[PDB]
Each structure stands twice: as structure tokens, then as C-alpha cells.
Amino acid sequence: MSLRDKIEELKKIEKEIEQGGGPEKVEKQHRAGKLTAWERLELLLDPGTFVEIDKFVEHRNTYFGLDKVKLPRDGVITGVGEINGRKVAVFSQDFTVMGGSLGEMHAKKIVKLLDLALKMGIPVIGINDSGGARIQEGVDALAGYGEIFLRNTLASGVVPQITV
Amino acid sequence: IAGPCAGGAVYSPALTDFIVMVDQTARMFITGPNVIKAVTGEEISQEDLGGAMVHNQKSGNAHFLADNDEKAMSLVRTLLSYLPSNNAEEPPVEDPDTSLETPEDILDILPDNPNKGYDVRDVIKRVVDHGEFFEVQPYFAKNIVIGFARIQGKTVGIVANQPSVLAGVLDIDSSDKAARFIRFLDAFNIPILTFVDTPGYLPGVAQEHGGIIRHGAKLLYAYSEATVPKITVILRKAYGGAYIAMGSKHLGADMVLAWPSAEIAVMGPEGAANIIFKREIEASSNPEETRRKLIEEYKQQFANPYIAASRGYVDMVIDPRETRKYIMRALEVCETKVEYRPKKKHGNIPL
């Protein structure tokens, strides 16, 4: 309703997105000896320096029951932070959301982040943790990968690219 | 302009970036009152034809009104303080504000009632260094606000809808005003900070017959062409072509933030819902109940800022109290933004 009611609603929506694939999937990540997508960033970056973008992105493909589910961040955290006072573009795949599978929107977020790293002249860090293509999205997932590969090639010898 | 400025004299000032005019003593016109009277019959004083207020308020020719020569000299010194010497230099860094916090009372500026306005300068000043805003062309096309300010000591230019004047619409004069300013900022390497709250273009036969099409396109061209950093904050309404024009992601903004009060829609929610549900409204056993149900529902489900955030058109929906901090950090990253344009002698902007 009011501006402060809408701020409280915004906070609800963000907490939900920040669950990832939920407490049970998160617990399983930890049992496997693995940190979550957000815990990794929290260790990688200078404290308090990370700005997320595209947190509210949602998938568009409806196939095979995708129209009945919400997929937080579409499985990937993208943003810019600092490492020892220098700007770095980072992405961190969230395995808790459909095995960290790469949907169309997931790919588009990484493409956007790579485009941005190149344009701003900052290193990119990719943290990979993914079963592969979200199979349900069909050829859009391959389009997604291809565009990423294209961005990696243009950035090659321009900004350093590190993968984990 | 610190005195008369008549005939061919006027064109040099028009070809410079900014014109300061001194209140009672400055006058500028191509043709004087005697010749106008001899040709048209119109009786007018030099002040009313081309005084400093006329050019600041009506003609759109001048950017500042100084009360006297002293004030005009200081005004010039202050304007230069925001600018580089040339286009190969970064603008200067002055008196940095490195605090991150936006005050709590930023939450009390927008009215509860969406039909009411507010002064957008109350938002600007709660986001920029030290609350300092140096307004350009304040008397002309007041439905849009433009000027200089600083973020962490570095010059930014501001473009903002003014919802307290003509509902914050865009029109012929506001397009001209903002478009030229944007092009100046771009040329001299200054970031562009845009604040959005607009329901669309001013309707009117005179707007259409006056060329709202070619004039409005100048603002699209200006943002699109610009390679400086472009950060945009949607405060409230952003409908139709006006959403696109006001530093949208689609014209190459680097970051788009939306307050939770933002309302992004293809047209006015009322007009959209009337078209889309045209049939259901006409087949209901009470149209105005269903039409009002559907309009509220359209606003809630379709016009909220999360639809555009879900597509990545809005990078983040944010607490208004985070606004200064997002801008500061975006601008730290964007200090090294390099963007290329096709090789051309120049473009063909609409005129």
C-alpha cells in the first residue's frame, strides 16, 4: 500500500529469493562439502563491497512444468565487488536451484556481466557449479551457452578471466 | 549577456554551451522593436521582447539569470568548477562527500496519493554530495529539471521529471532542454544521472502541429548516442514512450534502479486495461465495478517494477534509502567505461 508497506513487501521478496533452492537443498550442498553460491562470494570479495544485479530475474520458458515453479535468480548470482580495493565482476552459480542448470535467463545474466566486465575493463571471476543445460529450455539453453562463449572469446587478452 | 546584444551578434552566444543573462540590463534579439512595429504592427518593449527573463522563461535561449554583473561573474566561476578545460580531460574533483547514507526522510517526499506531485529537487538533494544542486535553465520547461551536482566530489549532470509541474510530462520544450544538456554532458565526459516520474507526453493539437515527434526524438537520440555513464532511478510513474526516453536500459543505461513505488507500464494502466479488457467490461452486468476491479489488478500485477526487473530491464528494485550508495558504487565502476560508436563525420539528429 504505502511506500513503507511496499518496502516491507520488497524485503519479503528478497528474503525468498535469498533462500536459493531452499533449506533442504542448502543442507545437502553443505553435506557434500560444498559452500553455497552466496557464501563463496562472501569469502571472495572485500567485505561489504558486493553489488548484486539482476536478483529479480525470472525464467520465461514454460515447457515441461517450468510455468509452475519459481527459480530464484534463475540459478546464478551476478555482480561487481572489490578484491583488495580493485573492481572485479563475479558470477556464482547456485546448485540448489535445479542443479545449477543453465536456463536462458541464467545465461543472459552471465552474458550481461561479461559484456559489462569487458566495457569497464575489469577482471571476471566465474564460479561454476552446474549439471549443465537446463534440458527443459531446449535450444534456448544452447543459444545461452553460445553467447557466453562468444563473450569469453572477445574478452580474451582484454580482461583476465578466472574460473573456479 | 551583460548589455545589449542585437542582430547578428546573437548567434555567437547561441553557438556556445551556456548563456548567462543579467536581469534588467541584458537584452538580446535579432530584430528590435522598431523594425517589428514597422513590419508587423506589434508594439513591444525591448525588455518584453528580449529581456533576461524572456530568454530564461519563454524562448529557451538562456540558461541562467543573474541579478547583476557581480553575480554573473560568480555564477560563471561556479559553473566552471563543474567542468573540464577540454574534452580530453576528466571533470575536476571538488569537496568530496564520501558518506553513503541517504536520510530517512527521503521516504516522506512522495505523497501517499499517486495523483499528487512533489518537488523532485527534494529527492535530488537527498542523494547528491552535501545536498548541493546547481540548476540549469530553471525558468524554462519546468516540467523537467536539469543541472550539475557531485557524487564523491565528481561532477554528474541531473535530468529529472518534475511531477509538480504539468504532471511531469514530456513535451517539445522539455525535450529540447534536456536533450541539449545531455549532449553537452556526453561531450565533456560527465556522467548522467536520471530521475524518472512521468505519465507520458503532453497531449495537444499544438504539440503535434508543433513537431513533438522531431523534438521528442532529440532526447532519444541524445541518450542513445551518449557513451558517458548513465544511471537511472525510477521513483514512480514511467509510462509508454516517456519511460523509454528517460534514460532507459534500452537506450544504453549502465544501471537502472527502481524504488518500490515505481510503476512501469506500456501505457497508462487505465487506458491499457480499457483496451485489453474491452470485451469483458462490455459483457459484465456492471461495467464500472469490473473496469475498476481490472484497473487495480492491472496496476498490481503488470505495472509493478518487478516485471521489468524479471527481464533485467531494471537491474535492481531498491529501498529508497539505498539510492545514494548504489549511485556512488555504480559510478566508481563506470569511471573506466569505454564504449565505441560507428565512424561518422557526425550524425543527423532531428532539429
Added chain:
Amino acid sequence: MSLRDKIEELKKIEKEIEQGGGPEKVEKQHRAGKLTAWERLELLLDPGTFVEIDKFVEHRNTYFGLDKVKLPRDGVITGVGEINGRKVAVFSQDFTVMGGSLGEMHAKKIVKLLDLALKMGIPVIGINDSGGARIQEGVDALAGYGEIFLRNTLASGVVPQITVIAGPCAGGAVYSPALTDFIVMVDQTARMFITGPNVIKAVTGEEISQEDLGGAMVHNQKSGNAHFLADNDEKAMSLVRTLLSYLPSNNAEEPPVEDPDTSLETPEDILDILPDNPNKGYDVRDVIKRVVDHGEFFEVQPYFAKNIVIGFARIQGKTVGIVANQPSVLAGVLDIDSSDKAARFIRFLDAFNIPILTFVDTPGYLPGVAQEHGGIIRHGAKLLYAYSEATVPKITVILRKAYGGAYIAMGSKHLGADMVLAWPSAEIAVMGPEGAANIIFKREIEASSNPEETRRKLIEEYKQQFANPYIAASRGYVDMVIDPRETRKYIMRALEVCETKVEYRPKKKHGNIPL
């Protein structure tokens, strides 16, 4: 099942797409006096040269019943064809598919087409025929328009962009046209407006028809938005082909050379155009046509600011742009509207490497409070900027009057003209000779027993002694005072030399032209 079975299937899928919105929507289109999107391309492009792309594109948004319909081509045909043997990118909106509304995929098709034109260095022809945003698709529709405008802006002054308005063009749809170089509007069937009459009526109480608000003639005559008025879709297609024949494919080419007139002569009757009475007007196009190849003049914006004339011609087969004061309309004064018309045309010419040929006969600027209050300073300054900035060859011929600021603005030597010629009828002065004598001789005239007689003699002596073309020629401002019958020869010879003209400009992202 088999490959040939799959070919038969493919052909069926294609035939269904080619129906557009269906037989009844096509009948309706034709009843409105409009051709289909495909019939238009057929006339526009050389026979059998069109290659369509993205024919099989389908919309993705499912809102408001959109998941229960097929929309062929998503309402737009895109591809590449030839016009007179040269490659051109084309799009053609299909009004029979949801009123030619712009969806997400429709827009992406057009974006892809513009990206391609730019990359390949070829012109773009947009045929618009659209109710506006597909509102059922919401912010994606707006995203679409936005990306189109960005592509138009990037392409601006790199490849020629021509828009034909051949039906409705409402809302944000209007801005892509505005960002293109030239707009052809079809009489009666074309309409363009941001806001429609019903919204205007609801908000301002003004009652107006669509034709009176945004018809082809309105935009040609009142608003200054459009450059040509075609009767017909057929006529609009032939107009586009003729226009392109003047233009290069892109900004890295010299313009095309076509059917050279190699004669040097200017007919004797060029001496009979300017009246004996210097207060009488004439049609400047009678001078233009006795100087350019074959007498052929292709006029741009002929209904708007008719006190100035612009268009394309050829000299020895090579494209030139014409800018000329029109003494038969508002005594050939400069004003807001003429300044806009000429300045934008000149910037186009310069961007695409076309010489500028100026014909000067102007007493100055239009006096009036509305001119001052409407910004004649900033608008007038656009013309000065446009000439000053131009690095293409600039040839200026002064036929008669050239007074004050307008002398300067009309391609003067001081703004970088490569050659300035004056007829013996030329009258170059710092302002109108009456106003100048009134200032210079203020004391003699006021002192006199008969101020009007005294004033009258001084004006005559001033015109004779100070305003003749030989004063400016004595300083080298006018390169030559010429016999009017020598005009064509001078222009040809100068243009031959100026083919290799190289001029630099300071490095900048761009300038800050007044708007």
C-alpha cells in the same frame, strides 16, 4: 516422413505465413486504399531480388490470450533486396496481423535488420503501418521500441535511413521515423501522432479528426516532420527508388554517378527570371532548373517553410544538394522553420559526402514577437553550425539580396564556402540599405529641412556605392562577380576541383549544436 514429405510440409507452413492476417483482413486493407506489406515490397524492390529472413519467427508472450493465437511473421516482413542493382535492407509492417502492432519479436526482427544494414554498409527502408505497441505484451513492447531507436541513432549518418508511413503510426511508433533521415507519407491513408484524438479530447477538450491531427499533409505542411507526400503506395515506392538513386549506400562512399549532362551552357532566358523591380519576387526553382543537369530537380519538404527551397539535383551526373531562398514566399526571409528545414538537410548532405549548392536572395530574418519568443536565435544558429561544420564542397551563388545575418548564414565564405559567385544583381550589405543609411546618416537626416528627400538620396547613393557586389569581391569574400549565363560552367569546374577536397575538424565525440 521423407525429405520430400518435409519439403511439402515446409511449403504449407510458408503459404500459411504468407496469408498474413487472413483473406478478410487483406480485403479490408485493400478497401482502405492500402496495399499489403508484401505488395509494397514487390513494387519497391527489383523483380525477384528480395531475400526474406526471420519469416518463421513466432511471438513468445502468453498474456491476455496471446498463447491461443499464431501471428505470422509477428507482423513484419524483414529482408534484403536490390534497388537498381544495389543492396538495400527493408522492413514492411503488416497491418493485417493485430493492427501491425509491435510485439517483442516483431521489434527484435527490425533490430536484427538494422544491425545488419549497419554492418553491411547498406541503406534501410522502413515501411510503417501499425496501430502502435502491442499492449498485451507490456514493457517488452517498450523494450522493443527502445532497442530500435538505439539502432537508428547508431546508424544515423552512417547508412541512409528512409521511412515510409503508409498507414497508422501511433504512440512510440512515431520516433523511429523521426530518427531516420527522410519520411515519405501517403496521402489519406497515412497518419502519425504520439497521442490520438480521443485522448486529446479527454485531456484538452480539443476535438480533431486523425487526418487533421496527423495526416500526411499536416506533417508535410505544419509540423515539419515529413519530407514527401505520395498520393499512393505505388507513388511512395517509386519516390523511394528515385531518392536512393541520389544517395550513397553508406558514409564511406562517394554518391552514385548517373546520366551526365556534359553541356556547359546556361540558357539565355536565365536573364529573364529576376524581375526588373527589386521589390518583386520570383520562383528560385526557375534559376535552379536552368543550372542543374537536364533541368531536373527533386525537391524535399516542398510544403513546409516554402520561403526556403531544398532538394537533390546533379551536376555532370554527380549528386548535389540545393539550398535556396525563395523570394516569392515571405520575400525569401529566414525564420525558425526555414532554418530547421535547411540545417537538417545540410547535415545529411555533409554526412553522406554530397556537395552543397546554395542560391542566395534574402533580405534577412522574419521580424515578429513570435519568432523571438519561439527561439529564432537558437533555431537560426543551427543553419550557421550546419554550414560551418560541413567539410563537403560548398558552392554559393548570390543572385540578388544578401543582407545582415542572412548573408552570413546562406553558405557565406566566412563559414567555409569553397567558392562564392555573385551575379551583377547581387546586393550585399551589413543590413538593409534603408536601415543602414538611417543609422550612418542619422545626424544629416535629422538636421535636414527635408529628411525624407535627404534620406532617399543617401539610400540610393549607399545602394550604389556600398552594396554592389564589388566591395565584397574587392576583399575576396566573393571570389568572382559573374555573368549569370556563366553560372553552370563555374559550378561544374569548381565541383571537379572539389572532388579531392579534404578538410579536418577537431577531435570530439560530437558537437553541441543548438536544439
